[PDB]
Design a protein around this motif. Structure first.
Motif: not given
Length: 147
Positions: A38-51, A119-123
């Motif tokens: 991506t040209v812009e940066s974004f957070p990529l997280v592995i999250a939730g019960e299914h990862n 979910a907010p805590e994923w930040l």
């Protein structure tokens, strides 16, 4: 008919757990075109019960995220919208992608499945440059109907 470029960063990538759905011709057509970030940066997280991997729609936070560029038909685009449970779980968003390898110039506009409904805590989870279900984070993808 016209087609559309998409950029996949998660379980849809080659070698990742949901790639088969892009190879199943009953869903339409998807042709691999190359690799990008991506040209812009974004957070990529592995999250939730299914990862699940989620590209959070917070432009300018996190990192440029790597992935793969495909050219898809309209049937496949609508299949992927349904697969990603848009617009509740993800929202399809058009982003500029820097081309790292091509099988177009320096960048290409691609649809990407981002999310504003995380979910907010994923930040507070680690922000990844790239996704691998088998990566050293130890959070392997598990399918949606698992409890």
């Amino acid at each position: 008919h016209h087609m559309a470029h998409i950029f996949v960063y998660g379980t849809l990538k080659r070698g990742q757990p949901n790639h088969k759905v892009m190879l199943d011709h009953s869903h339409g057509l998807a042709a691999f075109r190359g690799r990008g970030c991506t040209v812009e940066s974004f957070p990529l997280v592995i999250a939730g019960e299914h990862n699940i991997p989620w590209l959070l729609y917070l432009p300018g936070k996190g990192h440029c995220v790597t992935g793969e560029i495909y050219e898809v038909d309209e049937q496949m685009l609508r299949f992927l919208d349904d697969f990603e449970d848009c617009p509740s779980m993800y929202q399809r968003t058009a982003l500029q992608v820097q081309v790292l390898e091509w099988e177009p110039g320096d960048s290409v506009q691609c649809f990407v499945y981002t999310t504003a409904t995380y979910a907010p805590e994923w930040l507070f989870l680690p922000y990844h440059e790239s996704y691998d279900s088998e990566g050293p984070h130890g959070l392997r993808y598990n399918p949606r109907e698992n409890r």
